[PDB]
């Protein structure tokens, strides 16, 4: 295991009011698809009507795809310098809240880590995408289960960690193609018509558009019912919750459909991503400008802070906060 | 002790095939947003205008806002992410790394110092360019500053010493820098008028103010020109590039803030967006990335390596400008 923060300290321990994180780690959402960042539509009314949420509108992902993108979002070492060869084996910075005490805890309902957990216990992962943990599966024809799913049962987790800090990942499924129709509950159908096949190209382009975003306002409910969720321990905890997307997505420019495209030659809309932060005003925390020019570089900064720590590789660097 | 991060450097051709012959202007002060080709309202580029083979970037992002900051950075290895001015020195940077390659390397400074980007190479290789002892042109005007121009002359007798060989000649100008624009050049160049002739900037007219930078501009404009046609009289027996980046913007009032020096956390876009040019000879075979491709200043240290066909595993993936 090669370290990158072993003079990491936390300055003020859990004493002083515990802090609670959540971190969507969200998927295949396009910046320039967001109501705030220009868009033609309102595809994010909830987080509208919730104060103290800032949206950055100038984010750039690692990478285009989510084996690429998320193990990034928590590394040490930038885009410029990750390489998904060696990743796993670098101390990340979950590897580093984790050892000066902050509970981590990882919900996934996309995939897996993606590897990003691997050195932690195995009981802090949950696989979200079955019906065997997530409640919230019977919702809609296609028995897929739902991120809101995620959020039950999360007091329980809190109780078992009473007074700690406590980080919590939830991993999205929120747009991932190629069926968007499929990525949300019949009470998000609000643009029509939509594409319903799996090939993008014999689509009509403004039936693919309003199945992309529809998936959307499904990850804006999923979005304000987590800080809801951490608004009932605004009391015993300082809350906050940070979104960013993995990567963007094409939806039919020059041909182009999905991500996965090489860095060197993906096109603008698979790297532009939408971020939110969201903290209750008793915490003192104060968010970066809105047009703070951003990229997943600026993530494992923004954990550090949220939890007082201290590491001298990661700071002057720019953070969300 | 010198810290290295390209031991592994390596030359892919020998100057066999054709010696290859690269000016870099290091520019001073000049803002992306009153370059013409980037849609300034003013032709502050008129000779770059009419030389084929020139190609404009419209989105570069300087690492600094300062040229102790942003200079050591342009030749870093390290990235914007992990650079440290205070530690510089002691890096390769990518001048060790040519040099050692065989490219000769020459530093005419007519703006300040390397600083410290030059030092670990024989003082005989930087060379200054403020004072009448070096620069032939420097009773042009009624403050007796040496002009940047004054850098193209004689550089006939380095090539003519460096024969055959690869060569990069760095140029430090001193362009646009503050506050006394209407000071940074000759008469010729004072075309938009008023100018504003006074030190703090805030007491001036918007407009003279802007006079000021934009004429100081269009001396720029003239000094790279000038750089290119030097070069195009030996495209015969080298191929010949050019290569110009600002190290940082500048501010003209708004929000009240001028000059530039804001840390990186607070300052505005205007003291980061910065020019990039880069021109090449017919014949080279180089092919500039397309002009919107997003750039900081980390590209240029793999945009000299790859100018010579060196590859370093150490920024073999970085963006380049070409
Ligand atoms: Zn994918
Ligand atoms: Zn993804
Ligand atoms: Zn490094
Ligand atoms: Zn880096
Ligand atoms: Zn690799
Ligand atoms: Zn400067
Ligand atoms: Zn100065
Ligand atoms: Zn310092
Ligand atoms: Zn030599
Ligand atoms: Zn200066």
Redesign the pocket.
């Known amino acids: 295991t090669i370290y990158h923060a072993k003079d990491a300290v936390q300055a003020t321990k859990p004493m002083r009011k515990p802090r609670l994180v959540v971190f969507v780690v969200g998927e295949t959402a396009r910046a320039d698809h967001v109501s705030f960042n220009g868009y033609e539509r309102d595809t994010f009314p909830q987080l509208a009507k919730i104060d103290g949420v800032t949206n950055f509108s100038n984010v750039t992902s690692c990478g285009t795809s989510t084996a690429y993108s998320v193990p990034c979002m928590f590394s040490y070492l930038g885009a410029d310098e990750y390489?998904?060869?060696?990743a796993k084996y670098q101390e990340n910075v979950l590897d580093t809240l984790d050892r000066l005490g902050v509970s981590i805890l990882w919900r996934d309902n996309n995939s897996d880590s993606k590897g990003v957990m691997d050195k932690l216990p195995k009981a802090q992962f949950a696989d979200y995408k079955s019906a065997t943990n997530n409640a919230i599966c019977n919702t809609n024809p296609y028995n897929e289960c739902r991120d809101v799913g995620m959020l039950v049962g999360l007091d329980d987790f809190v109780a078992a960690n009473n007074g700690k800090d406590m980080l919590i990942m939830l991993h999205q499924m929120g747009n991932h193609g190629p069926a968007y129709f499929k990525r949300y509950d019949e009470k998000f159908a609000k643009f029509t018509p939509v594409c319903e096949g799996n090939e993008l190209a014999k689509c009509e382009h403004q039936s693919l558009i309003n199945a992309y975003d529809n998936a959307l306002l499904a990850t804006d409910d999923f979005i304000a019912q987590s800080i809801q969720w951490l608004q009932t321990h605004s009391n015993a905890y300082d809350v906050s919750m940070l979104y960013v997307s993995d990567h963007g997505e094409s939806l039919g420019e020059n041909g182009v459909y999905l991500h996965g495209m090489p860095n060197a030659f993906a096109p603008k809309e698979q790297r532009s991503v939408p971020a939110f932060f969201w903290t209750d005003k008793q915490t003192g925390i104060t968010p970066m400008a809105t047009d703070t020019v951003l990229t997943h570089d600026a993530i494992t900064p923004t954990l550090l802070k949220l939890f007082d720590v201290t590491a001298d590789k990661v700071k002057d660097r720019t953070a969300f906060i």
């Open positions: 390489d998904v060869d060696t």
